[PDB]
Design a protein around this ligand. Structure first.
Ligand SMILES: [Zn+2]
Lengths: 76, 29, 77
């Protein structure tokens, strides 16, 4: 399915995903498109920060959903 | 008042905060 | 473990805490470092107020996480 990822600068990234994809898998797909390391990414959906380890299905993220990408400093 | 969604990133913020915890945008404009 | 606290002034302080330190111990460290009595502290992380009787791990607070200090109340238990 397709989902959309919006940056804070108003660009939309289109991603091809499956419900069983982990949040880490999604961050890797964003890295492919944007060059941003997963460790510098926060994804927000429906008010919640998406946790590494969980899947899209864990957050009831369906086809055509928009996630929001917020950058972070890499944690040490 | 009520927990509030940030206009930019949707993060559901605590009512005691005036700026978004994630992206630092002010609650209102 | 280092965590950050955004203080009332807008400065940020670093705390050295146990990975599952109690919220009460964290407030005690904030009192010592910043001077705010624990009763007057309200700590926010991930849109949630942090409760006494819980630990950092209850909130998935990890190294270099940032907590936000706000005046209690008017929440405010
Ligand atoms: Zn935001």
């Amino acid at each position: 399915m397709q989902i959309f990822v919006k940056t804070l600068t108003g660009k939309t990234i289109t991603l091809e995903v499956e419900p069983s994809d982990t949040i880490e898998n999604v961050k890797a797909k964003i890295q492919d498109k944007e060059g941003i390391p997963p460790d510098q990414q926060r994804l927000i959906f429906a008010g919640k920060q998406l946790e590494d380890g969980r899947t899209l299905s864990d957050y009831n993220i369906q086809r055509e959903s928009t996630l929001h990408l917020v950058l972070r400093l890499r944690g040490g | 008042g009520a927990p509030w969604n940030c206009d930019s990133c949707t993060f559901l913020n605590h009512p005691a905060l005036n700026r978004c915890e994630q992206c630092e945008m002010p609650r209102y404009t």
